[PDB]
Write a protein that binds this ligand. Structure first.
Ligand SMILES: Nc1nc2c(ncn2[C@@H]2O[C@H](COP(=O)(O)OP(=O)(O)O)[C@@H](O)[C@H]2O)c(=O)[nH]1
Ligand SMILES: [Mg+2]
Length: 371
């Protein structure tokens, strides 16, 4: 009964048909009993998720094979923040491109950002083909998309591209609805089933550290991923030198560490399966800077800026370095930056983090490269 799960969403330039396509998928699959149909205005007027406000619409649907959690956002800003903060992280993305307009810079930005934040697969719905009649023009637009995808390491020659009309399929023209079913067919067969968080190496951020007579040292947290059992040896990674310990028991999630004293463990470091995650100070990251109206910051970022980077449980100060030719980053903009932290942190590609000054959040980011 329960089907494999896949997180997806519609990326692309504004007004190329992201929200219409989302409505068309649910409306068409409702005819196969695979979804509850959602209207265009439900998805367009998206709810708010959150220390950063993001407008994200959530629809659900099923093919006969899989269950999809689908994410759609109103504006470009929401897509930058959703893909960075990982509010609803995706194992694949449906790239919507207008056949009349062709690829635009937000198409470029969403592909670059999708590659940098860890979106592993891409399917292309070439939309609004009811407005175009020249087939040579469609062939060229498709070539531009494939080359644009290859420019950012996606397999442009292998990625499925379906020409369709989200609107005409929404209004119920059966021949256009078939291109929706071919999109989902392409999604079922091209986007692989994600690995389970519990198949991955074990990882638990440390929040508190107690010492109760009769239980030694207790460490509390939330298992990010993986699984830990009784008597397993785990490493403590981040901030200090890495050290080993055995898990006496899990009490619920308080982990009793067999032979670690209380001052040898602190908030900020993580429990991990030995040799699975390592400490680092230097990394590159895709960062979004909060705009003025978001309570972020009314002055720009700059090279040498030294804010705190909140990784999982604690703040860690670090110095900022912006791309070549960039000196200031305005509020509301995003950028890729190099960061050198004061102290090492258990770090991996895809780790989210907030950027704060004192108490306030001025940015958000994803680790995209380790150094
Ligand atoms: N003719 C045509 N119009 C479309 C199609 N898809 C979307 N539109 C129109 O494009 C406009 C904006 O589309 P929208 O779904 O808001 O794109 P989004 O901003 O990327 O989510 C709307 O007024 C739609 O009616 C299509 O396949 N064909
Ligand atoms: Mg829309």
């Amino acid at each position: 009964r329960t089907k494999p799960h896949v997180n997806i969403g519609t990326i692309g330039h504004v007004d190329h048909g992201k929200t219409t396509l989302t409505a068309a998928i649910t409306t068409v699959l409702a005819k196969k009993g695979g979804a509850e149909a959602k209207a265009y205005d439900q998805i367009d007027n998206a709810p708010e998720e959150k220390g950063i406000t993001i407008n994200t619409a959530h629809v659900e649907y099923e093919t006969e094979n899989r269950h999809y959690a689908h994410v759609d956002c109103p504006g470009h800003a929401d897509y930058v923040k959703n893909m960075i903060t990982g509010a609803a992280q995706m194992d694949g993305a449906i790239l919507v491109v207008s056949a009349a307009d062709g690829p635009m810079p937000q198409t470029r930005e969403h592909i670059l950002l999708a590659r940098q934040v860890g979106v592993p697969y891409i399917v292309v719905f070439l939309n609004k083909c009811d407005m175009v009649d020249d087939e040579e023009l469609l062939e060229l637009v498709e070539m531009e998309v494939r080359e644009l995808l290859s420019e950012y390491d996606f397999p442009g020659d292998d990625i499925p591209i379906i020409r369709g009309s989200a609107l005409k399929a929404l209004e119920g023209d059966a021949e256009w609805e078939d291109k929706i079913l071919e999109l989902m067919d392409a999604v079922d067969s091209y986007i692989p089933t994600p690995e389970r968080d519990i198949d991955k190496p074990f990882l638990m951020p440390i929040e508190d550290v107690f010492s109760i007579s009769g239980r030694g040292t207790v460490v509390t947290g939330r298992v990010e991923r993986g699984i830990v059992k009784v008597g397993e040896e785990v490493e403590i990674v981040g901030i200090k030198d890495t050290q080993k310990t055995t898990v006496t028991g899990v009490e619920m999630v308080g982990a009793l560490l067999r032979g670690t004293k209380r001052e040898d463990v602190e908030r900020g470091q993580v429990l991990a399966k030995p040799g699975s995650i390592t400490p680092h100070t230097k990394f590159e990251a895709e960062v979004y800077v909060l705009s003025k109206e978001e309570g972020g910051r009314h002055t720009p970022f700059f090279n040498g800026y030294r804010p705190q980077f909140y990784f999982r449980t604690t703040d860690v100060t670090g110095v900022i370095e912006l791309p070549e030719g960039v000196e200031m980053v305005m509020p509301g903009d995003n950028v890729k930056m190099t960061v050198e932290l004061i102290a090492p942190i258990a770090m991996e590609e895809g780790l989210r983090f907030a950027i704060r000054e004192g108490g306030r959040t001025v940015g958000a980011g994803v680790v995209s490269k380790i150094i």
